[PDB]
Amino acid sequence: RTNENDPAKHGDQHEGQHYNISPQDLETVFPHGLPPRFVMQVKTFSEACLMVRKPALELLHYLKNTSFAYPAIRYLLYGEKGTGKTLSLCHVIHFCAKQDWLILHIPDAHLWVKNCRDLLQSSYNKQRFDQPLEASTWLKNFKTTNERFLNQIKVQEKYVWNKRESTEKGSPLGEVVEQGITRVRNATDAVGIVLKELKRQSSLGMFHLLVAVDGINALWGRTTLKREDKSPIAPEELALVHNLRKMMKNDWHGGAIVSALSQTGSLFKPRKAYLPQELLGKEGFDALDPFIPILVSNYNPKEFESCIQYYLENNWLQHEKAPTEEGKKELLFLSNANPSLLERHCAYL
RNA sequence: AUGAGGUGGCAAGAAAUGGGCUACAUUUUCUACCCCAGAAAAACGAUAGCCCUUAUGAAACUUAAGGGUCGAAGGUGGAUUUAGC
Ligand SMILES: Nc1ncnc2c1ncn2[C@@H]1O[C@H](COP(=O)(O)OP(=O)(O)OP(=O)(O)O)[C@@H](O)[C@H]1O
Ligand SMILES: Nc1nc2c(ncn2[C@@H]2O[C@H](COP(=O)(O)OP(=O)(O)O)[C@@H](O)[C@H]2O)c(=O)[nH]1
Ligand SMILES: [Mg+2]
C-alpha cells in the first residue's frame, strides 16, 4: 500500500492511493469529527488509511491556490448519502493542520440542534439559549486540536463571566478556553467569544483560520428542541447556532471556510434528498451564496478495487469466497461502489 | 287493559367468570426519517382517576375526541388451555 503520511506528496496522480494519518496526528488533529464507523475501523485495523479521492484533491488544490488576503471563500462538499463527504473534509482538515493552520472544526452541527435536555436561558442575552454540555465538549475538543496556537493568541477585549469573574484584555485565548471548559455554565458564551476572537485574528493576519463544519444545513434548518412552555425553538435562538452563522459569513479574510452537507442526522429532510438547495433550505442557500460546491460520489472501479485490496491486506474480508472475482462483483453490485454501504457490507464478511 | 299515550327513572359493586386491548421494555422508548441517525434507559407502563376544552345533540352528569394533571398495578405469569401447515 501507499502507507504515506506526508500531506505534500499526494496529488492527482495519487488518486486511488492511500494516505496515512499517524497515531499522534489521529490523537491531536482528530479528537472528534471522524465518523464513528471509521473510528471503529481505525481502532480495529490500528491504521488510519484514507483513500485519496478526487473531491478531496480538488479541495486541496483550491486551498493551496487561495490567498489569505481575499475574503473567506466558502467550499461546500455535497453528495449522496455515504459517499465520503465527512472523510474528505477530514482529509482536508488534516492536510491544513499539517500546514500549521488553525483548525476550527465542528464535528456535527446536527448535534447542537437536536436531543438537548440541558438547555438554559442565556444570561448574556435573554432572547437566546445556551447548551452547556455541547459547548463544553466542543471547547475540550478545540483545545485538544489547536493547543499549539491556543497560548500564542492574545484576546483583544475584556470579557466578563460574572460580577466577580472576568477575563482581561490581552490575556491568552487559552485562558478563555480553559474558563469555558472548567466553568461549564459559561462555556457556551466562551465558545462565541473564541469564535469572535478567531474571526478578528483571521482579519489581523495572526494565522490562517480554517472553519470546518459538518452538516452545515443544520444551521438554517429546524430544531427539535422545546421551550419550558413546550414551544418550538428557532435555530437562531441558540447562541452556538447564531455564532456559527456569524462565522459562516464571508465578511472576514485570512483563510477559508469548508463545510460538508450531511442528510444523515438532519431534521425534517427526506432520506433521498442530497442536493445543496434541498438540504440547506432557501434561507441556508441564501446565506451561503456564493459558494463553491464540490460533488462527492461513489467509488470508481479503481477506487473500489483499491478499497477491496486494502480490506484484503488487513484480512478484514474473512469470508473464504471474498478474494474471488465473483465475490468482488457481488460486493460491487450490492454496494454500487458506495463507500458507506461497501464498508457496512464488508463489516460482516 | 296483559291494549294505547305522556313525564321521570335503573345500568351499582362484595364478588366470580369468559373474551379483548395495552403492557411488563433494550429485537425497547423519544425524535427525525420511513430503515446507514441522535438521544433515553429504574425509566418502561393507563384508552384508568381528577380537571378543562371541543365535537354531536334540544338535553353530555352518563358518549366520543383532544389537552392538562396524575405515573399507579405490573417486572413474562401455576395446573391447565387457545390458534396456526
Ligand atoms: N476516502 C475514503 N477512504 C476510505 N473510506 C472512506 C473514504 N470516504 C468514505 N469512506 C468510508 O465511508 C464511511 C463513512 O462515510 P462518510 O461519513 O465519510 O460519508 P458521508 O456521506 O459524509 O456520511 P454521512 O451522510 O453519514 O454524514 C466509512 O465506512 C469510510 O470507510
Ligand atoms: N459572558 C460574556 N460573553 C461574551 C462577552 N462578550 C462576548 N460574549 C459572547 O460572544 C457573543 C458576542 O457576540 P456579539 O459580537 O455581541 O454579536 P451581537 O450580539 O449580534 O452584537 C455572545 O454570544 C456572548 O456569548 C462578555 O463580555 N461576557
Ligand atoms: Mg336494575
Cα torsion through A329, A331, A337, A341, rounded to 10 = 170
Residue A53 · residue A62 · CB < 8 Å: no
SS3 content of chain A, % helix, strand, coil (to 5): 45, 15, 40
Query: Strand B closer than 7 Å to the CB of A41?
Result: no
Verify whether ligand 2 is closer than 6 Å to residue A120 (CB atom).
Answer: no
User: Which residues does A56 contact at the CB level (< 8 Å), separation at least 6?
Assistant: A88, A91, A92
PDB resolution in Å: 3.0
Mapped onto helix, strand or coil, the DSSP state of residue A330 is helix
Protein-covered nucleotides of chain B (CB closer than 7 Å) are: 30-40, 68
Measured CA to CA, the distance from residue A41 to residue A49 in angstroms comes to: 10
H or E element in which residue A210 lies:
strand A209-214
- Cβ of A85 near strand B (under 7 Å)? The reply is no
Phi-psi sector, A257: left (phi>0), alpha (psi -120 to 50), beta: beta
Residue A19, H or E segment: strand A18-20
Return the exposure string of A18-54: e unless at least 16 CB atoms fall within 10 Å of the residue's CB, then b: bbbbeeebbeebbbbbbbebbeebbeebebbbbbbbb
The DSSP string of A135-156 is HHHHHHHHHHHTHHHHTTPBP-
Q: How was this structure determined?
A: cryo-EM
Q: In the numeric block, which cell numbers belong to residue A44?
A: 480495529
A339 conformational bin, left if phi > 0, alpha if psi -120 to 50, beta if neither = alpha
As a whole number of angstroms, the distance between CA A73 and CA A305 comes to 35
A267: the nucleotide nearest its CA (via C1') is: B32
For A63-83, b/e burial (b = at least 16 CB within 10 A) is beeeeeeeebbbbbbbbbebb
From the centroid of its chain, how far is CA A311?
26
| Alpha carbon distances (Å) from A184 to A135, A138, A306 | 8, 11, 45
Taking CB atoms and a 6 Å cutoff, what residues make up the pocket around ligand 1?
A: A 35, 37-38, 41, 50-51, 53, 81-87, 260, 262-264, 339-340, 343
How many angstroms separate the CA atoms of A22 and A27, rounded? 9
Instruction: Of A261, A297, A314, give the one whose Cα is nearest residue A18.
Output: A314
A321 three-class SS: coil
Tell me the three cell numbers of residue A261. Answer: 452537507
**CA of A17 and C1' of B30: distance in angstroms?**
43
